[PDB]
Design a binder for this molecule. Structure first.
Ligand code: HEM
Ligand code: HU6
Length: 373
């Protein structure tokens, strides 16, 4: 609905995100729109240290505040990590930290770039009247020339949107179980499965638009956060807003709601067990927008789709449920292959990880939810 901020077209993504802020914030937008020249020239940190402190009161609707969070989030990554060679700032200047933490407290999100900023809200259509294909789309902000962030954010964004074609179906599922309508529940479970088989096809495009070397050595440096990071073992200091330094995880698709939400639906208990995999994904729910957090809890509160299918001794229904579970395993087995190509191999050309065993624990938990192998 509209109380969960889910769009019929783009799902958990933000529809037609604002690209422009009020005139009153050009000093923010000037830095955010030129990070590649500013970082590379050495001017970025000084142009943020000079910056006046600006109030947030003039960010009037949601899309304004979201673009602002993206501006401020990307500026911060570039400040903290600099040129991404290892000189890290450990203090973020009050003149930018303070409005960032205040706009963050307002949207119930952490003051750091999250998946909802740099993917869900970091896109435009080139042509309003062409479709959401990679070739009529662009991102608003990047960090460096050759960081391959268009290719990465937008392919991520596109697989998000592909899987959102199945969100439409979720209420149908829950009504069908409560109204005891076996035929339309089976039909919903197979449509969902069709949607997740589709979204795998979309994923194939990563190979055309993201190069392994550029991805491993550049974009990865800027998305890193500061929770368990040796390089900021104690966190970032939000000057004038906090106390002592504060730890906050970097962006990840662990912060994506579509994939967490199909696990919950199908009764795949990714967040159970007290393991590290389950803790990370539970923790990452706090970097989701609150309406989406709240929608994952609506799901967790309905009756188990999975118990309902086991209890009915109904083979077509067990097969449709498995089509779903099998489509998630497909996505994740493919995704493991892309980690192999885009992290593991590039890292092996540097004068398994953890990672990898993380992802294969999530793959394993999915696979083990099949009713019949
Ligand atoms: C559209 C493309 C992508 C999607 C849908 C996606 C989705 C996800 C999801 C849902 C997770 C959480 C674990 C899970 O649920 O499986 C995850 C974790 C991860 N993904 Fe991806 N991802 C994408 C692109 C990439 C690329 C290109 C790479 C590597 C080059 C990558 C590397 C990772 C890594 C390293 C993790 C685990 C550690 C972390 O959170 O960063 N992903 N991804
Ligand atoms: O540790 C990894 C190193 C490689 C890239 C970034 C980080 C993980 N961060 C991510 C961020 C976004 Br935005 C989308 C994603 N999709 N999959 C991972 C992932």
């Amino acid at each position: 609905s509209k109380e969960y901020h889910i769009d019929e077209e783009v799902g958990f993504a933000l529809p037609n995100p604002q690209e422009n802020l009020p005139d009153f914030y050009n000093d923010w937008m000037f830095i955010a729109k030129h990070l590649p020249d500013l970082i590379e020239s050495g001017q970025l940190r000084e142009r943020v240290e000079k910056l006046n402190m600006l109030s947030i009161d003039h960010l009037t609707d949601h899309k304004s505040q979201r673009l602002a969070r993206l501006v401020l989030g990307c500026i911060t990554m570039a400040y903290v990590w600099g040129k991404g060679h290892g000189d890290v700032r450990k203090v973020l200047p009050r003149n930018i930290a303070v409005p960032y933490c205040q706009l963050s407290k307002k949207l119930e999100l952490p003051p750091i770039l999250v998946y909802a900023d740099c993917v869900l809200a970091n896109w435009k259509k080139k042509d309003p009247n062409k479709p959401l294909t990679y070739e009529n789309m662009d991102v608003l902000f990047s960090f460096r020339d050759g960081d391959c962030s268009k290719g990465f954010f937008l392919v991520s964004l596109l697989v998000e949107i592909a899987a959102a074609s199945a969100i439409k179906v979720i209420p149908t599922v829950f009504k069908a179980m409560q109204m005891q309508e076996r035929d339309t529940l089976l039909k919903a479970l197979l449509e969902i499965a069709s949607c997740l088989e589709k979204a795998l096809q979309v994923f194939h495009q990563i190979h055309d638009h993201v190069n392994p070397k550029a991805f491993f050595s550049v974009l990865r440096i800027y998305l890193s956060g500061w929770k368990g990071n040796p390089q900021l073992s104690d966190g970032l200091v939000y000057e004038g807003f906090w106390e002592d330094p504060k730890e906050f995880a970097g962006g990840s698709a662990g912060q994506s709601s579509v994939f967490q939400c199909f696990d919950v639906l199908l009764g795949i208990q990714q967040t159970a067990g007290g393991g590290h995999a389950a803790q990370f994904l539970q923790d990452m729910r706090r970097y989701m927008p609150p309406a989406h957090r709240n929608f994952l809890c609506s799901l967790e509160s309905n009756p188990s789709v999975r118990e309902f299918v086991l209890s009915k001794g109904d083979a077509g229904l067990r097969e449709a449920y498995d089509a779903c579970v099998k489509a998630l395993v497909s996505l994740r087995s493919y995704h493991l292959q892309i980690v192999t190509k885009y992290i593991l191999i590039p890292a092996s050309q540097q004068p398994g990880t953890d990672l990898m065993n993380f992802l294969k624990t999530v793959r394993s938990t999915t696979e083990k939810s099949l009713l019949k192998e």
